[PDB]
Design a protein around this ligand. Structure first.
Ligand SMILES: *[C@H](CC(=O)Nc1ccc(C(=O)Nc2cccc(Nc3ncc(Cl)c(-c4c[nH]c5ccccc45)n3)c2)cc1)CN(C)C
Lengths: 65, 276, 284
């Protein structure tokens, strides 16, 4: 029984969030703080912060109790 | 994340009527326990006292040293609101519960503060500070158990920042989305006073604050909802969102701050209740 | 209380765990309730995945708190240290698959485990692997951790801000331990761990890590050629060697994430991962 990758299916009840690799091409990174060389050395990029902020802004926007 | 959080699952309610029912049930339960009288305060008086002590908690966290992150203050306020949904001020004193809420919020939000420097922010004698610390340590487990062990609180500040980033990126019509920050922050502060945190999602609250600031600035961004957010495909979703924003604005506009004379009378009544 | 002590499961870094009636209870050690237990509760009350341990209950008195989890039969360290157990490539594939799925679910919710080791990978009698010991787990994304043997080189250089790479390096170390049945890089100090890493894999240059010197606790090492990967793992296939190479990249940005590793050809190749009901079980 071979394995086939299947992406995680989690409903967010909000607008679609652009992909992390596409944030730079779409101009999102122009409005976040640029990561310092030390942050890049440790593996931290501004794309992560922008993606998290965008995910938080859209989560549960179309949901009612 | 919020879309599978315990805040959405267990601490977001349909309407203010359910909140009033829960508060009345708590008051009635404490009255029944006491029986098993004019001194008892009514649920609306309990609400007035809770609002006054929430303001006291806000000004306590405002002058906290070292500087307290705003997320910690929001977490403490949410803890206070959740605790007094199913508890009466006539059983647990809100003066100590606010301090326990601030203590637990500082612990949960990874804001490292030791107990001596926490109690040093109180305008009390060292003996009074030690007594307050002992009360906080006694009530910490009670606060945790009354929260159903749901300590992660989602605040509208991160969704607000994300919405601002999206407006700066995909909405050239709004030339400078940074001019709406102050009024949106004021609207968020006014939202925090009402029961909006227990009835709406943080993203909805942030969007409501942003569009309230835009309306007060004379800017209309119905295209941002319809076009940028792809709501022109789903019209009923747009109508529901607009109705949610209108309900939030109505909640904000009808809130009445507590009055000093009533606050003093209720404080005397609460002191009489707790002494006896 | 409602629980009766049965056995003694061991001592953690911050608590004493025992088997009770089946569940497992951690007894956490003027500051109030311990921050590690609060962190574990606040993080495990927000996650729901088959490969993540679920917090069942919590109680205590005043500033003493006790946590109750579902009881797991064993952990991966007992599996590895057992000399009577044969770790076939299918078993290794299944263990890595469960670990990577759990870590992908954890990372999508912006949480780093930061304490990953074979003893923290719990196994039940049904063969399901779970991640536990979230007392050091932290949320990341908003602008001196992990055990030394499984600590990433960027952590050993005093990195303050990091991402999923610190978990993926530990995952690579666990994979190497599964392959060799012994700890891959068993150092006794941070400098010794860095020396062992550079001897086994080679000293990285400015092309494999474009910001080596930016880290505060960074020191210059001798240039080691590095042992070839197929020399270290003689039985590893080409796809497994590619997965190991991706897992052990010195650049934390270039290091493969959990989703990227799950998409790799190693997991989709043959044979398929062993089902949990057929995974090796330590004999009594
Ligand atoms: C005969 C048959 C038999 O079953 N023998 C046997 C073999 C192996 C083990 C074993 O290793 N058990 C074990 C070790 C460690 C941990 C656990 N489970 C567990 N579950 C929940 C939690 Cl939260 C933890 C945990 C988290 N952090 C921790 C730190 C330290 C210790 C635990 C811990 N662990 C199971 C047992 C039995 C047996 N009889 C005679 C028939």
């Amino acid at each position: 029984a071979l394995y086939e990758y299947q992406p995680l299916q989690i409903e967010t009840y909000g607008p679609h969030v652009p992909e992390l690799e596409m944030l730079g091409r779409l101009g999102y990174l122009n409005h976040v703080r640029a990561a310092s060389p030390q942050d890049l050395a440790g593996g931290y990029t501004s794309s992560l912060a922008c993606h998290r902020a965008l995910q938080d802004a859209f989560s549960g926007l179309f949901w009612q109790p | 994340m919020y879309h599978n959080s315990s805040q959405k699952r267990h601490w977001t309610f349909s309407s203010e009527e359910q909140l009033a029912r829960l508060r009345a049930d708590a008051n009635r339960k404490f009255r029944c326990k006491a029986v098993a009288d004019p001194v008892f305060l009514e649920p609306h008086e309990e609400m007035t006292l809770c609002k006054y002590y929430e303001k006291r908690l806000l000004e306590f966290c405002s002058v906290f040293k070292p500087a307290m992150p705003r997320s910690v203050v929001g977490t403490a306020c949410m803890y206070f609101k959740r605790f007094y949904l199913n508890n009466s001020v006539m059983e647990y004193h809100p003066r100590i519960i606010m301090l326990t809420c601030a203590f637990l919020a500082c612990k949960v939000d990874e804001f490292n503060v030791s107990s001596p420097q926490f109690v040093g922010n109180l305008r009390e004698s060292p003996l009074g500070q030690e007594k307050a610390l002992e009360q906080i340590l006694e009530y910490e487990l009670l606060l945790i158990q009354q929260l159903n062990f749901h300590l992660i609180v989602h605040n509208p500040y991160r969704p607000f920042e994300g919405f601002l980033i999206d407006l700066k990126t995909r909405y050239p019509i709004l030339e400078n989305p940074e001019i709406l920050r102050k009024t949106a922050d004021d609207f968020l502060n006014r939202i925090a006073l009402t029961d909006a945190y227990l009835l709406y999602t943080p993203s909805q609250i942030a969007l409501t604050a942003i569009l309230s600031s835009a309306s007060r600035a004379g800017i209309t961004m119905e295209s941002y909802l319809s076009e940028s957010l792809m709501l022109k495909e789903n019209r009923t979703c747009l109508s529901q969102l607009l109705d949610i924003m209108k309900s939030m604005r109505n909640l904000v506009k009808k809130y009445e701050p507590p009055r000093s004379e009533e606050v003093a009378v209720l404080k005397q009544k609460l002191e009489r209740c707790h002494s006896a | 209380k409602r629980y009766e002590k049965l056995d003694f499961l061991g001592e953690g870094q911050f608590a004493t765990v025992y088997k009770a009636r089946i569940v497992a209870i951690k007894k956490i050690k003027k500051d109030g309730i311990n921050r590690t237990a609060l962190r574990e509760i606040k993080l495990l009350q927000e996650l729901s995945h088959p490969n993540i341990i679920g917090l069942l209950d919590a109680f205590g008195h005043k500033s003493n708190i006790s946590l109750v989890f579902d009881f797991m039969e064993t952990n991966l360290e007992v599996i590895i240290k057992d000399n009577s157990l044969v770790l076939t490539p299918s078993h290794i594939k299944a263990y890595m698959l469960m670990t990577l799925q759990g870590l992908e679910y954890l990372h999508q919710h912006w949480i780093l485990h930061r304490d990953l080791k074979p003893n923290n990978l719990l196994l039940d009698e049904n063969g399901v692997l779970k991640l536990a010991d979230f007392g050091l787990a932290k949320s990341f994304g908003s602008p001196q951790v992990v055990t030394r043997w499984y600590r990433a080189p960027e952590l050993l250089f005093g990195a303050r801000m990091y991402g999923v790479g610190v978990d993926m390096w530990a995952v690579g170390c666990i994979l190497a331990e599964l392959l060799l049945r012994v700890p891959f890089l068993p150092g006794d100090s941070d400098l010794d761990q860095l020396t062992r890493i550079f001897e086994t894999l080679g000293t990285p240059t400015e092309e494999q890590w474009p910001d080596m010197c930016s880290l505060p606790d960074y020191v210059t090492f001798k240039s080691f050629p590095g042992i070839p990967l197929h020399h270290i793992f003689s039985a590893a296939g080409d796809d497994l060697l590619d997965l190991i190479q991706g897992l052990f990249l010195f650049n934390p940005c270039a290091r493969i994430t959990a989703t990227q590793a799950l998409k790799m050809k190693y997991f989709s190749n043959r044979p398929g991962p062993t089902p949990g009901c057929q995974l090796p079980r330590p004999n009594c």
